[PDB]
């Protein structure tokens, strides 16, 4: 029987549970203080500096509407057209048939 350690050294880091948990807390806290401080400095601005001066500063999003199309076929410039078929073809065919 073979036993393969495919655990990239995690074995060695001590108190792995608590260590793990700390990283998570430090991250999550840093996120929530940073987002809570910004949401308050942002309201302080709307108070001190009016909400009508900040209202003419947001942009307007535009939302798409449906433009169903008949989808006619595309007609190329004649220059390119004559490149497709042999030049001999011009007027060879009775287009009535």
């Amino acid at each position: 029987p073979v036993m393969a350690d495919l655990n990239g050294g995690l074995q060695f880091v001590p108190e792995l549970k608590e260590f793990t948990a700390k990283l998570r807390k430090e991250l999550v806290e840093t996120s929530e203080v940073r987002k809570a401080v910004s949401i308050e400095t942002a309201l302080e601005h709307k108070v001190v500096n009016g909400n009508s001066a900040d209202a003419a500063y947001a942009q307007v999003e535009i939302q798409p509407r449906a433009n169903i199309q008949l989808d006619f076929p595309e007609l190329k410039p004649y220059k390119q057209v004559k490149q497709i078929a042999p030049a001999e073809l011009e007027g060879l065919l009775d287009l009535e048939r």
Binding site: P1, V2, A4, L6, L16, K17
Partner: protein, 48 residues
């Protein structure tokens, strides 16, 4: 065998750690019983 390096190291596995630790008896059962020509055990300790 999908083995684990962390037998109830972390919080509430449910009964995961128990399942994953039990597997490790095959490293001996291979020798002590009689299926050695039908199966071979290869225990992988899957990491992060």
């Amino acid at each position: 065998l999908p083995m684990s390096p962390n037998h109830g190291t972390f919080g509430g596995d449910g009964m995961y750690s128990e399942s994953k630790l039990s597997l490790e008896t095959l490293f001996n059962r291979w020798h002590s019983e009689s299926w050695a020509n039908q199966l071979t055990v290869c225990g992988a300790i899957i990491g992060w």
